[PDB]
mmCIF file with all atom_site columns, C-alpha atoms and ligand atoms in Angstrom:
data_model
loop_
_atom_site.group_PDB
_atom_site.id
_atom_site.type_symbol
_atom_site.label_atom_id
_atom_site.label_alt_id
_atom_site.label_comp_id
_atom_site.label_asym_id
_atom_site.label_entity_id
_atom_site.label_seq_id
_atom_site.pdbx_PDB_ins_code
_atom_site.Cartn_x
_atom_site.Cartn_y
_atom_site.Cartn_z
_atom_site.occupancy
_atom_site.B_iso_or_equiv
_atom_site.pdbx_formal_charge
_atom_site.auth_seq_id
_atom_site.auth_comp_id
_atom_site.auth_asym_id
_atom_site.auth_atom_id
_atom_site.pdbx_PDB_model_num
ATOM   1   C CA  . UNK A 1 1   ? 0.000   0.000   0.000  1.00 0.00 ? 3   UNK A CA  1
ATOM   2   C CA  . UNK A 1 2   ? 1.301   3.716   -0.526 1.00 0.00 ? 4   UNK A CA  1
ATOM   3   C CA  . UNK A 1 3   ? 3.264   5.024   2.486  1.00 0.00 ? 5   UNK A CA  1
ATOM   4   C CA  . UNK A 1 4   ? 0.852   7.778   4.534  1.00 0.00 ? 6   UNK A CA  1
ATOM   5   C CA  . UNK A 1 5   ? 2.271   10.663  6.599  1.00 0.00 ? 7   UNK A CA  1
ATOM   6   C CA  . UNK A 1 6   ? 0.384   13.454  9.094  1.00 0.00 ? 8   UNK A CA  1
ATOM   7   C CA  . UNK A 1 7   ? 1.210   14.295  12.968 1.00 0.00 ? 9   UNK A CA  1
ATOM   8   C CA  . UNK A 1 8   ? 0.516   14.027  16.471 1.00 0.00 ? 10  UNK A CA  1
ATOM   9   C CA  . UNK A 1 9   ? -0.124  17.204  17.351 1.00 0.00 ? 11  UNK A CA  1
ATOM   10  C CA  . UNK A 1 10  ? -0.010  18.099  20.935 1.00 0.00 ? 12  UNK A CA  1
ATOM   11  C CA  . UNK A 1 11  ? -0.805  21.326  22.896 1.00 0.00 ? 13  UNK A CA  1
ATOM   12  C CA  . UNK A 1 12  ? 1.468   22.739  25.764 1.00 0.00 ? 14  UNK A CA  1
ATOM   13  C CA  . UNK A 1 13  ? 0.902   20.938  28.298 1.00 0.00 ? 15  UNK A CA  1
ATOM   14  C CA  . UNK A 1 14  ? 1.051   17.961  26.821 1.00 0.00 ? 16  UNK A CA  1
ATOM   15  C CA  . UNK A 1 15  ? -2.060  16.231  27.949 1.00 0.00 ? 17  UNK A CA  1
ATOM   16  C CA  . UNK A 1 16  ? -3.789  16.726  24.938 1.00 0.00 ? 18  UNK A CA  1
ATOM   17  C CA  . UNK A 1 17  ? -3.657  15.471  21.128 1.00 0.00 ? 19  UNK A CA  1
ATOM   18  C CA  . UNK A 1 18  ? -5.044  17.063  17.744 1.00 0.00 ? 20  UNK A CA  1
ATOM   19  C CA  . UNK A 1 19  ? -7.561  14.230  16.398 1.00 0.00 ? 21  UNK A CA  1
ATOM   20  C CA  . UNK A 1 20  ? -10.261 14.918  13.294 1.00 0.00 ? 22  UNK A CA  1
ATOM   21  C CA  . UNK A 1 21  ? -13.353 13.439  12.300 1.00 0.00 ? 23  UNK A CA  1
ATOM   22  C CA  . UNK A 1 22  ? -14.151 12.201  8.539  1.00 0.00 ? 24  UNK A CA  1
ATOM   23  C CA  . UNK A 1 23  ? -17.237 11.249  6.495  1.00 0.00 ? 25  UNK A CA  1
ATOM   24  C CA  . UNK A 1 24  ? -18.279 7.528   5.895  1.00 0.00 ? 26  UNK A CA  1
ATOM   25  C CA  . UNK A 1 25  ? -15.244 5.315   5.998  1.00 0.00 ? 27  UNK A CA  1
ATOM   26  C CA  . UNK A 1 26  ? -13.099 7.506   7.417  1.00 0.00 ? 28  UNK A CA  1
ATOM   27  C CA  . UNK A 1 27  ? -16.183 8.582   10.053 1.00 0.00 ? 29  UNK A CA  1
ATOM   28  C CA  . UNK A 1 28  ? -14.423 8.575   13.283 1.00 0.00 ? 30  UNK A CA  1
ATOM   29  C CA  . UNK A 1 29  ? -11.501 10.183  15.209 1.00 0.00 ? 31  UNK A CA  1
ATOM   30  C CA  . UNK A 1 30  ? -8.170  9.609   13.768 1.00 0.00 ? 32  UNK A CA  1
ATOM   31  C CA  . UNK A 1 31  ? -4.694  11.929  13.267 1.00 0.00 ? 33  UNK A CA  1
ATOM   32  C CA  . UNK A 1 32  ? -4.462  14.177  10.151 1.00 0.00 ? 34  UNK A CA  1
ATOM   33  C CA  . UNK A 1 33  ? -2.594  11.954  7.850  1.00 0.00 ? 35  UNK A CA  1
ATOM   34  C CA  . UNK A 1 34  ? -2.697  11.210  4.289  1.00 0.00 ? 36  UNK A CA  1
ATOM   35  C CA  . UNK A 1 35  ? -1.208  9.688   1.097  1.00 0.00 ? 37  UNK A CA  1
ATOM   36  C CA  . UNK A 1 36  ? 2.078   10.622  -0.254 1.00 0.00 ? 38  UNK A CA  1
ATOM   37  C CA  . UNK A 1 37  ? 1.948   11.767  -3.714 1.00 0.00 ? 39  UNK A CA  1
ATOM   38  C CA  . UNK A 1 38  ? 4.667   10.791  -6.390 1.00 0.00 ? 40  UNK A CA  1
ATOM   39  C CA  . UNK A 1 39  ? 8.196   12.257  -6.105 1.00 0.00 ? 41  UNK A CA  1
ATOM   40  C CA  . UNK A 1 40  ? 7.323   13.695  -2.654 1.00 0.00 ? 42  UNK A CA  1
ATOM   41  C CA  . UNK A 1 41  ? 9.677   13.911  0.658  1.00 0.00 ? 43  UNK A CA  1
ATOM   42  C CA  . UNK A 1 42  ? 8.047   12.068  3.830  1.00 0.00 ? 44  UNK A CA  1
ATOM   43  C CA  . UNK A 1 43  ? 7.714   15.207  5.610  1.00 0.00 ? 45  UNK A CA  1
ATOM   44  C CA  . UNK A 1 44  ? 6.297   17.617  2.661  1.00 0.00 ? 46  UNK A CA  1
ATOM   45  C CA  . UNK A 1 45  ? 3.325   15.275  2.865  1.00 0.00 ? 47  UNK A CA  1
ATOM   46  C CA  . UNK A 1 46  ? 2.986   15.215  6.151  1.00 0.00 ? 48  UNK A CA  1
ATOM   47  C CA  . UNK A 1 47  ? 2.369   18.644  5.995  1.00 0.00 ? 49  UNK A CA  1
ATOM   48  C CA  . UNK A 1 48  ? 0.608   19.134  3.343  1.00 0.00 ? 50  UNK A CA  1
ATOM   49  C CA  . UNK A 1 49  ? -1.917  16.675  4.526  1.00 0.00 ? 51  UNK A CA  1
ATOM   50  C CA  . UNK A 1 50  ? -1.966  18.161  8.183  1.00 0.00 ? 52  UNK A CA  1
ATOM   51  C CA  . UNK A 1 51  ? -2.722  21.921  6.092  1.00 0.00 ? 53  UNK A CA  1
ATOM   52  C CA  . UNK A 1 52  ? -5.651  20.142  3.999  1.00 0.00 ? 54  UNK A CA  1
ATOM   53  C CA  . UNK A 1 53  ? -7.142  18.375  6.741  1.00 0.00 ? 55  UNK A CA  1
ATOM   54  C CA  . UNK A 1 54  ? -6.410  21.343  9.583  1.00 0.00 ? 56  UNK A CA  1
ATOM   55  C CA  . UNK A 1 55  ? -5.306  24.351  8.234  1.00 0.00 ? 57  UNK A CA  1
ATOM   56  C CA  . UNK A 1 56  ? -2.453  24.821  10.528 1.00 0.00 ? 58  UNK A CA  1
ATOM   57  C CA  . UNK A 1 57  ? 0.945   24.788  9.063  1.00 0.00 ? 59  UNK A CA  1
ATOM   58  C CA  . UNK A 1 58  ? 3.633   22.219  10.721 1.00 0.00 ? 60  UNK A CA  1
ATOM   59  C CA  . UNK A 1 59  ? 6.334   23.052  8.188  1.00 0.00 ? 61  UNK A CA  1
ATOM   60  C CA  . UNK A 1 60  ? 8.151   25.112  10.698 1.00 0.00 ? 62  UNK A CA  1
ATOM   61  C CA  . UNK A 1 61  ? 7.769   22.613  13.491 1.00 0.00 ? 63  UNK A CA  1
ATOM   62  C CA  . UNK A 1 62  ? 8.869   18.896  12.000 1.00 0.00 ? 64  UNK A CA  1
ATOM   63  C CA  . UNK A 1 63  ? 11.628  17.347  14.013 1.00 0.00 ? 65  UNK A CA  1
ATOM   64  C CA  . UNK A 1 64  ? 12.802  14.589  11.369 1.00 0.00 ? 66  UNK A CA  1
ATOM   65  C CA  . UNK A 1 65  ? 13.522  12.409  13.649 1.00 0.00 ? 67  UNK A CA  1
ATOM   66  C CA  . UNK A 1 66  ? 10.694  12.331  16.075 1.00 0.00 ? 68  UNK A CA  1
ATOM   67  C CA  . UNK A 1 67  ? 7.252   10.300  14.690 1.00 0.00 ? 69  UNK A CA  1
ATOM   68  C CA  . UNK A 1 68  ? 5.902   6.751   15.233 1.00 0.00 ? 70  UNK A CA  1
ATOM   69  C CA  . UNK A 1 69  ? 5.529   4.846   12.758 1.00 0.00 ? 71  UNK A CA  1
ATOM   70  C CA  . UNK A 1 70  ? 3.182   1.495   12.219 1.00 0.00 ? 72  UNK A CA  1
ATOM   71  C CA  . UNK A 1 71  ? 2.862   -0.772  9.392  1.00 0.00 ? 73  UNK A CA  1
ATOM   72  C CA  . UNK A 1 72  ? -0.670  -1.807  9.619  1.00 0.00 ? 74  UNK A CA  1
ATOM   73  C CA  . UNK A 1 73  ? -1.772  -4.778  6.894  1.00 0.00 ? 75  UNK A CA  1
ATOM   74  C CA  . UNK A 1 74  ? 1.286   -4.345  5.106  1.00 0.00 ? 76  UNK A CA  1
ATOM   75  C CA  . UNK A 1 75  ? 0.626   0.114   4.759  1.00 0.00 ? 77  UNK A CA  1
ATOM   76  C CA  . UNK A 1 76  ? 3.202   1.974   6.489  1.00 0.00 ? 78  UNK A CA  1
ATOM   77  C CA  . UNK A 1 77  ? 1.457   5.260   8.432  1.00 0.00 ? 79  UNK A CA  1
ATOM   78  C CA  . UNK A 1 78  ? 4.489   7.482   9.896  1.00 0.00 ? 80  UNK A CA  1
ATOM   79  C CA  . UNK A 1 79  ? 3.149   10.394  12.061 1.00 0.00 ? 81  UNK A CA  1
ATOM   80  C CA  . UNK A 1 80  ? 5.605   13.280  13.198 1.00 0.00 ? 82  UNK A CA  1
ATOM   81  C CA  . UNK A 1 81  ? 5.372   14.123  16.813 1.00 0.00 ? 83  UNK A CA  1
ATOM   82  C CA  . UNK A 1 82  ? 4.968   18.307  17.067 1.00 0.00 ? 84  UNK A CA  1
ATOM   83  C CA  . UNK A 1 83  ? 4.232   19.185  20.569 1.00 0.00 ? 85  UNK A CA  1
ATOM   84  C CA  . UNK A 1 84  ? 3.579   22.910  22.312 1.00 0.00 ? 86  UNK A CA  1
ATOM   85  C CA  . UNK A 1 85  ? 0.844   23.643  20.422 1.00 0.00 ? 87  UNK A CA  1
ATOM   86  C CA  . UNK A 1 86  ? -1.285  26.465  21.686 1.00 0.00 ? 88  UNK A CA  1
ATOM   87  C CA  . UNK A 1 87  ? -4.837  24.992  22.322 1.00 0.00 ? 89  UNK A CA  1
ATOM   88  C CA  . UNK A 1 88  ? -6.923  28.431  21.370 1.00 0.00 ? 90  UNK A CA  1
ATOM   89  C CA  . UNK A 1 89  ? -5.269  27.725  17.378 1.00 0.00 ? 91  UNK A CA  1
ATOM   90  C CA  . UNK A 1 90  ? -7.527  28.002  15.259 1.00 0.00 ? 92  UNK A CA  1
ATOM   91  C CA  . UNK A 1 91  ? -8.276  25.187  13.468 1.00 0.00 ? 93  UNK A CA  1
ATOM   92  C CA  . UNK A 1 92  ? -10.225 25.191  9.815  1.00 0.00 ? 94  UNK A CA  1
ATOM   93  C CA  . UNK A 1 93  ? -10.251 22.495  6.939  1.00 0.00 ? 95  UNK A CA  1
ATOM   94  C CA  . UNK A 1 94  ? -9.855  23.127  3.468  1.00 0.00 ? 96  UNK A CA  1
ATOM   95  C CA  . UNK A 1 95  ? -12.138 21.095  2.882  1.00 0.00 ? 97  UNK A CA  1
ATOM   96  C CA  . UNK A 1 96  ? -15.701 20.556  4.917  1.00 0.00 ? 98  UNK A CA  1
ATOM   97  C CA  . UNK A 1 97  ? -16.591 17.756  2.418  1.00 0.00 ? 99  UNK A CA  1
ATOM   98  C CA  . UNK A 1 98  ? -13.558 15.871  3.899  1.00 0.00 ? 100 UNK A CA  1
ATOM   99  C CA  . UNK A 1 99  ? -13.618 16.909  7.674  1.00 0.00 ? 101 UNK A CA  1
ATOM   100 C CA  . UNK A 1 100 ? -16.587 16.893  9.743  1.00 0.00 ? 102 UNK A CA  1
ATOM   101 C CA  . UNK A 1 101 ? -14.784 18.163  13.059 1.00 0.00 ? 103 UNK A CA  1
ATOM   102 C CA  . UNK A 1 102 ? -11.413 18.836  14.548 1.00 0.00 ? 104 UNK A CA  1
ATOM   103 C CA  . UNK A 1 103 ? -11.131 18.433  18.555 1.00 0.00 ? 105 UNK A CA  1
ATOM   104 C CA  . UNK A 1 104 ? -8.478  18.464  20.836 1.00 0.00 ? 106 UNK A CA  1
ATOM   105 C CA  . UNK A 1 105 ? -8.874  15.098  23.617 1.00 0.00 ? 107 UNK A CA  1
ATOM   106 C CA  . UNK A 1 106 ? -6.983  14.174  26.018 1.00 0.00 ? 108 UNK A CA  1
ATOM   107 C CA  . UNK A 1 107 ? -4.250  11.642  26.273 1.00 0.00 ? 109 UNK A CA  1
ATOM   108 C CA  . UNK A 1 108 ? -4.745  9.960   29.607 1.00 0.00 ? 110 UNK A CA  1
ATOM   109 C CA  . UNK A 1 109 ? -8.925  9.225   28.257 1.00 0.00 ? 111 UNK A CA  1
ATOM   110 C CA  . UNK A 1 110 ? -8.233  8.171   25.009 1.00 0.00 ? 112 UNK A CA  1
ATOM   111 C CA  . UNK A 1 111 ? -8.471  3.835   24.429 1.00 0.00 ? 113 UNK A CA  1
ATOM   112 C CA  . UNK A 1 112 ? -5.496  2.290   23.570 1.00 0.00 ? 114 UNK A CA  1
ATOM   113 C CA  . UNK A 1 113 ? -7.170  -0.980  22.714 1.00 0.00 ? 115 UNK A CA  1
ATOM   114 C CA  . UNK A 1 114 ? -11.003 -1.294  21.359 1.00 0.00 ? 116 UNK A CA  1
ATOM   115 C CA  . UNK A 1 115 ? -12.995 -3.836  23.837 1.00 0.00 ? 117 UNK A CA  1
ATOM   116 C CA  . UNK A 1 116 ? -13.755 -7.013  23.089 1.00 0.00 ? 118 UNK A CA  1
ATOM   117 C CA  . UNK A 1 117 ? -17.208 -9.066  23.471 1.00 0.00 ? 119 UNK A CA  1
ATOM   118 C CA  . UNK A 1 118 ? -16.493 -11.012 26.455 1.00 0.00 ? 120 UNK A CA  1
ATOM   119 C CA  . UNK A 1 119 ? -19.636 -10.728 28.218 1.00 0.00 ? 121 UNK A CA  1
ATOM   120 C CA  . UNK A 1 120 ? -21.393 -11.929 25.331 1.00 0.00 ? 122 UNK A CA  1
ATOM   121 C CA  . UNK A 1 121 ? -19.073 -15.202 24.201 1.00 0.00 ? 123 UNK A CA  1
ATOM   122 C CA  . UNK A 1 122 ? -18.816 -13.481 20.888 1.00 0.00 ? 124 UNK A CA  1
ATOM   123 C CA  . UNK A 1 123 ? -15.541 -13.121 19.082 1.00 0.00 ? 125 UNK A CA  1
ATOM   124 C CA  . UNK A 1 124 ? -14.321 -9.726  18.088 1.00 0.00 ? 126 UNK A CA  1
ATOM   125 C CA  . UNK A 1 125 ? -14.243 -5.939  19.008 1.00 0.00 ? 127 UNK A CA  1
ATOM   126 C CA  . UNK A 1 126 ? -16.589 -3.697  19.993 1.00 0.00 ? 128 UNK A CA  1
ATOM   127 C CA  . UNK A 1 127 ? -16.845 -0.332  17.577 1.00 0.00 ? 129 UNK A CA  1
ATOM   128 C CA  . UNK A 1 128 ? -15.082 1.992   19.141 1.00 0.00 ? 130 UNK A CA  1
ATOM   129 C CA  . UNK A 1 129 ? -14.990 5.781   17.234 1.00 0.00 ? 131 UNK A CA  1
ATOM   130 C CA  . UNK A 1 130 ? -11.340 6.075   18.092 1.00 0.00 ? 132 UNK A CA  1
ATOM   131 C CA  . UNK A 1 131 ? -10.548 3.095   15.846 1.00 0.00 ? 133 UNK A CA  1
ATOM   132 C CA  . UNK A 1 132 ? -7.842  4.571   13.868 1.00 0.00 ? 134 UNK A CA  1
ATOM   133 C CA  . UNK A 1 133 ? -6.038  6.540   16.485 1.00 0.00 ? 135 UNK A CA  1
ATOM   134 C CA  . UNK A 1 134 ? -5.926  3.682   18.750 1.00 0.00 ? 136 UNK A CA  1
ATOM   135 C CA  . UNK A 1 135 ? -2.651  2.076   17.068 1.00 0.00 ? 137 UNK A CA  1
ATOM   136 C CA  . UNK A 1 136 ? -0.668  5.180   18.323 1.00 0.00 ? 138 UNK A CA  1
ATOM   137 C CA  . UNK A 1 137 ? -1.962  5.473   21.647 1.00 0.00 ? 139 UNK A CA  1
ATOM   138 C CA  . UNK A 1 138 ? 0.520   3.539   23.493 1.00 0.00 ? 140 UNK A CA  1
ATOM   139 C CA  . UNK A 1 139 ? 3.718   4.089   21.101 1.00 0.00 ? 141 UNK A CA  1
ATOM   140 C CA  . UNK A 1 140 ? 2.906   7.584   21.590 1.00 0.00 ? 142 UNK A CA  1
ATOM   141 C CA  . UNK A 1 141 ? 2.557   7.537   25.425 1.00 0.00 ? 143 UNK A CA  1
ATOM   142 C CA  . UNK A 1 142 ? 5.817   5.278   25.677 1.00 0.00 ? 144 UNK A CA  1
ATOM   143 C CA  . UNK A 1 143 ? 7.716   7.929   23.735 1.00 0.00 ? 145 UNK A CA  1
ATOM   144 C CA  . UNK A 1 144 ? 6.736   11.081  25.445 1.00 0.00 ? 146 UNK A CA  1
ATOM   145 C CA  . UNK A 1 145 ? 7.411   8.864   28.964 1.00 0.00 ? 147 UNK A CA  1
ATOM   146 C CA  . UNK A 1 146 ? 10.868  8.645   26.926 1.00 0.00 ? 148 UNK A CA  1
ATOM   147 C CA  . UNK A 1 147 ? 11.181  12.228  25.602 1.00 0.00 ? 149 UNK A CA  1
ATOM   148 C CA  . UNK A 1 148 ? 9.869   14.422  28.355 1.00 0.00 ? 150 UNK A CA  1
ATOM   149 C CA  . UNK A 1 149 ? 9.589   12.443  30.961 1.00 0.00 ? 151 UNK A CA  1
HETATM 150 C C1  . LIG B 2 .   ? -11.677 2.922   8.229  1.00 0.00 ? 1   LIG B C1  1
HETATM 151 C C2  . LIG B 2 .   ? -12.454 3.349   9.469  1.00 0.00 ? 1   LIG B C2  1
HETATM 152 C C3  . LIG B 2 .   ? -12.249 4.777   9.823  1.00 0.00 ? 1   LIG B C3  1
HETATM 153 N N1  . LIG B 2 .   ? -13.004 5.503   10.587 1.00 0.00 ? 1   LIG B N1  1
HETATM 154 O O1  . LIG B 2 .   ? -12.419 6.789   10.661 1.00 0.00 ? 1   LIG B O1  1
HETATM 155 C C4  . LIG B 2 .   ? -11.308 6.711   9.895  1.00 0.00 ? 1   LIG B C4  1
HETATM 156 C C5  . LIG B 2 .   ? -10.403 7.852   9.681  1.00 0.00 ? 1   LIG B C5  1
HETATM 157 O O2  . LIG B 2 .   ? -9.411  7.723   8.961  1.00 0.00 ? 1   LIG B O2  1
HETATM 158 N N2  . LIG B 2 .   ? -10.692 8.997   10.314 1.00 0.00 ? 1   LIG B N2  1
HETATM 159 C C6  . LIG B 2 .   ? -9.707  10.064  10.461 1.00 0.00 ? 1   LIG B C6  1
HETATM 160 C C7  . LIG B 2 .   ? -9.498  10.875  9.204  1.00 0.00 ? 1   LIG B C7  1
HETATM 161 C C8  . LIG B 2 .   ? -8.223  11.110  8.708  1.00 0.00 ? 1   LIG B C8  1
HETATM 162 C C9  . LIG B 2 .   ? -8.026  11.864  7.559  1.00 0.00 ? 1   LIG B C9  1
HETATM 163 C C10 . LIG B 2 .   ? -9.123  12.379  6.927  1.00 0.00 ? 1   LIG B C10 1
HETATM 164 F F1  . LIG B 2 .   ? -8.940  13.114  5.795  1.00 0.00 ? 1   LIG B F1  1
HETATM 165 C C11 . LIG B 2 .   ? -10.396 12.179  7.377  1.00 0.00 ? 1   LIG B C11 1
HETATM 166 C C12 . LIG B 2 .   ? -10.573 11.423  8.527  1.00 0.00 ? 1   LIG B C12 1
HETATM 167 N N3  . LIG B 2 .   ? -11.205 5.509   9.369  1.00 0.00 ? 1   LIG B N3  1
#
């Protein structure tokens, strides 16, 4: 599958991450990421998909070595770390036919698994809305635990 690059944005106090909401199959919460277009550098794309999807510019802000990347099904997804972000940004789409909503949550709430059917003897998950994001959850706690302490 073609590689796809966004960020983990956090604010200042580093409790909180940058999620946004799509339409239909991409309906839930999940990191501003994208596909990487012919020719183009790993961090270009990431963002240029974070200014489509959020309309805040990370150019400025990309450490090149700090993301987490996961290869999920055989699709690599690499998403740049860019923390001390002020939570009052302002936050606007270019595109409303993409992006339903963009919401800052916090860390320490957000799953890091999905649940599974248990109670009911049922194999599986449960839905969970933070499907996508999930992946990252724990990576991206054990890093900052790493970086920041
Ligand atoms: C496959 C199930 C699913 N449900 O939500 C998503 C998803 O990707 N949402 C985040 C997102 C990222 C970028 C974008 F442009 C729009 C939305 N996937």
């Amino acid at each position: 599958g073609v590689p796809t690059y966004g960020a983990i944005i956090l604010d200042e106090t580093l409790e909180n991450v940058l999620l946004v909401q799509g339409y239909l199959a991409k309906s839930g919460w999940g990191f501003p990421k994208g596909k990487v277009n012919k020719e183009e550098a790993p961090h270009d794309c990431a963002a240029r998909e974070v200014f489509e999807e959020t309309g805040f510019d990370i150019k400025d802000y990309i450490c090149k070595d700090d993301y987490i990347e996961l290869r999920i099904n055989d699709q690599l997804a690499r998403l740049y770390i860019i923390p001390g972000i002020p939570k009052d940004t302002k936050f606007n789409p270019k595109t409303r036919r993409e992006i339903r909503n963009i919401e800052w949550f916090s860390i320490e709430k957000l799953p890091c698994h999905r649940n599974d059917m248990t109670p009911k003897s049922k194999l599986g998950l449960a839905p969970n809305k933070f499907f996508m994001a999930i992946p990252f959850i724990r990576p991206l706690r054990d890093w900052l635990s790493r970086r920041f302490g």
